[PDB]
Amino acid sequence: MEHVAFGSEDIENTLAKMDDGQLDGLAFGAIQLDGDGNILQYNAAEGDITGRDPKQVIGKNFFKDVAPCTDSPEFYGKFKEGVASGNLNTMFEYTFDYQMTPTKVKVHMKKALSGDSYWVFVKRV
Template sequence: MSAPSLPDFDDPKLAARVEALPPAALDALPFGAIRVDAYGVVQLYSAAERRLSGSGDRPRLGLHFFSAVASCMDTPAFRGRIDKALAAGRLDLEFGWTGDFADAERGLRVRAQSAAGGGYWLFLQRED
């Protein structure tokens, strides 16, 4: 049996494709993946995101994403966009962001999509 193909960052159904992967495959993605529940608590933080961001092995699971993991993203331009889309009923956003653990000036492409069963996914692709 062959390994499942990994989804592309630009896949319109990225969240659904990621949810269909075995858990170990998330760590092989060429971009970061973070699953946050309906309360903002981190349920999954991929090894790919740890590696690509340079954030290391800090605790993530079970912590509130915006207050305990990425307080720099707790802004109207980042969290505000997500909260507004969630309030409208369906989250499917893409936007640019500047800043990373290892490099505060690094550009990121951010995709936020609703997760099955509530909550949402954050996908982060670093610009070269």
């Protein structure tokens, strides 16, 4: 179990050293997206929250395929502005309700250390 706290100010540096094996040891959900919203990494904790099987969602588009409930100005809109601008760091509450029991979460989106990749961190509230 990797000791990293949700919302840590230097979270991008710490997660840069993790492979999709060490990501599964986080206490919160973590998804890594490319600039188009395609899923590059998806950890075990996220699968526990949402029911998705990590290996099966990698490669899919988060906003178009996996999470249509996030295709809105309040989530996808913030992501798109972040990708276009070059920086992103925002935290907000949201409800995930597609093909699942509605679940309230806290989401933290932040640009990764690498060029065109972005993190989406999730925890229950």
